[PDB]
Amino acid sequence: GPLLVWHRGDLRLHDHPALLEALARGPVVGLVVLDPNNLKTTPRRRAWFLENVRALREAYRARGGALWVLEGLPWEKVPEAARRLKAKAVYALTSHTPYGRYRDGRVREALPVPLHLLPAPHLLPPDLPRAYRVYTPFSRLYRGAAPPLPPPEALPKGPEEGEIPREDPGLPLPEPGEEAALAGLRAFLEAKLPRYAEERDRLDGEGGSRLSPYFALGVLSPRLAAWEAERRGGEGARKWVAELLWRDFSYHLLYHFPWMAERPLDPRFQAFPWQEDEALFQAWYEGKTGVPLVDAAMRELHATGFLSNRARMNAAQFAVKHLLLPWKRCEEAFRHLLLDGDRAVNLQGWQWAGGLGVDAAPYFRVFNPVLQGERHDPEGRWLKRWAPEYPSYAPKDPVVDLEEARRRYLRLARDLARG
Ligand SMILES: Cc1cc2nc3c(=O)[nH]c(=O)nc-3n(C[C@H](O)[C@H](O)[C@H](O)COP(=O)(O)OP(=O)(O)OC[C@H]3O[C@@H](n4cnc5c(N)ncnc54)[C@H](O)[C@@H]3O)c2cc1C
Ligand SMILES: O=c1nc2n(C[C@@H](O)[C@H](O)[C@@H](O)CO)c3cc(O)ccc3cc-2c(=O)[nH]1
Ligand SMILES: [Cl-]
Ligand SMILES: [Cl-]
Ligand SMILES: [Cl-]
């Protein structure tokens, strides 16, 4: 009887504890379940996930192995596959999310064989006992990456079942699959890493790796990435690994503070008088604010499914601080546009950019959207690609009065934080 390897947000063969744990015991068959709880999302994200599942199947086939893909609720389909295959047990990487725990609990109940869950590779795990709200103390627990696990060589023969739907992303996807991811990683470490510290705050994000869409789906292990960067070493290297660690900090935060999906981490802000306003929400959402930087960011996001960190923090903070828009709606609309959209990481980013309690980032830091563009888009090349409407970073009939909006937020936030 084979062992089932159930891939979720780990669509790869390299550094995959569940895959190896299973293969060491006997023949394996891989499984992906196309779960409506994750797939009732935007076309771009459905297609990014589907095409990486397709790539993983190709990877299994190229090694002579079998990847099943079934559609439906995991607690129906996983036991289905285990019965049809006569599997002895199912292996998967632990998910520490509320839905991960719910789903895996229901799967374990419905399976008449063990579900063996192994820790996913991390730089630091999300579920350490100590809760940290601040990145520095959390980051000090990291002492360098453990070595990643090899991929299998050839995989054991088995029967393949199930179809992988072809869906329209509506935009150009990156090349899916771990072969493309690993090529991307090795090029970045070679060419860009040396100046990463000096170039990671560009509005165009061209100093960075552009690997988040692979990290989000586990197509690339963060442990392997951290290990490879550390073997490279030099100055870029420490700073880039620090950013990998921000990803793990985000999982840590949502794990210890699950209620931050509902309300600010900082309790002083839980009564902030946000101002719902359909028109303003839409102006922001569609990048029609009259603020060049913000409009460029949101138009790039709509068209591509990616945005640099420096653009994300400007676009997100503008909504929260300059527009006073309810953050939850904005957060969710933002995640749905992102190929790398990842609930914990996006929540972290929004609560950080919004001055809502992450990393004790102070309320009083308010981006000046013309200075931000001046500092992070040299000859204005980025503004020109994405909103050439605008001759400069100067706001052009902005949907709000920018200085008043600034003064208004700071007044409100000064009352709240210091009262
Ligand atoms: C408002 C806001 C929302 C965000 N939403 C998401 C999201 O849903 N999914 C997502 O993957 N990232 C999100 N980010 C984090 C970050 O901006 C992206 O991961 C980054 O832009 C990816 O570009 P890159 O791969 O070139 O990063 P690099 O600079 O090359 O960094 C390497 C990797 O480290 C991680 N990383 C880098 N910066 C951060 C960060 N600020 N926080 C957490 N991890 C980080 C990512 O996994 C990234 O691929 C958000 C940031 C903000 C401020
Ligand atoms: O196991 C799945 N994971 C999917 N995930 C990956 C996870 O959400 C996965 O369940 C883990 O994130 C939790 O173990 C997706 C992620 C996206 O960004 C977009 C689409 C999906 C779709 C699925 C899916 O159908 N099945
Ligand atoms: Cl979603
Ligand atoms: Cl177990
Ligand atoms: Cl190891």
Spans of all domains in the chain: 1-120, 121-148+178-257, 258-419
The structure's method of determination equals: X-ray
Ligand 2 interacting residues, C-beta cut-off 6 A: 8-9, 33-35, 38-39, 41, 45, 49, 95, 97, 100, 216-217, 341
Which of 5, 6, 8 to mutate for ligand 2's pocket (most ligand atoms within 8 Å of CB)? 8
User: By three-state DSSP, how is residue 205 classified?
Assistant: coil
User: By three-state DSSP, how is residue 91 classified?
Assistant: strand
CA distance 229 to 145: 9
Residues 246, 174, 8: CA angle, nearest 5 degrees: 60
Q: Which residues pair with 6 in a beta bridge?
A: 31
Q: Which amino acid is at 33?
A: V
Domain 1-120 has CATH 3.40.50.620: yes
> What resolution in Å is listed for this PDB structure?
2.0
CATH architecture for residues 258-419: Orthogonal Bundle (1.10)
Counting from 1 in the atom list of ligand 1, the atom nearest the Cα of 209 is 30
CA distance 300 to 21: 42
- Phi/psi at 238 (5° precision): -65, -40
Which of the ligands is closest to the CA of residue 150? 5
Question: Gaps in the chain (C–N > 2.5 Å) come after which residues?
Answer: none
- Phi/psi at 345 (5° precision): -70, -45
Token reading at 364: 């009083």
CA distance 64 to 59: 9
Torsion sign, CA atoms 274, 276, 277, 283:
positive
Token reading at 10: 């780990």
Going by alpha carbons, the residue nearest to atom 8 of ligand 1 is: 341
Among candidate residues 364, 379, 373, the one with its CA nearest the CA of residue 396: 373
- Around Cβ 1, how many Cβ atoms within 10 Å? 12
Q: Is 109 a catalytic residue?
A: no
- Asked whether the beta carbons of 179 and 54 are under 8 A apart, the reply is no
CA distance 309 to 349: 9
Q: Do domains 1-120 and 258-419 have the same CATH topology?
A: no
User: By three-state DSSP, how is residue 34 classified?
Assistant: strand
- Asked whether the beta carbons of 267 and 376 are under 8 A apart, the reply is no
Distances, alpha carbon 118 to alpha carbons 21, 154, 308, 311, in Å: 9, 22, 33, 36
CA distance 377 to 296: 12
> Which residues have CB under 8 Å from 399's CB, separation 6+?
280, 283, 288, 289, 290, 291, 323
CA distance 37 to 11: 18
Which of 5, 12, 41, 49 to mutate for ligand 2's pocket (most ligand atoms within 8 Å of CB)? 49
CATH for 121-148+178-257 is 1.25.40.80
DSSP 321: I
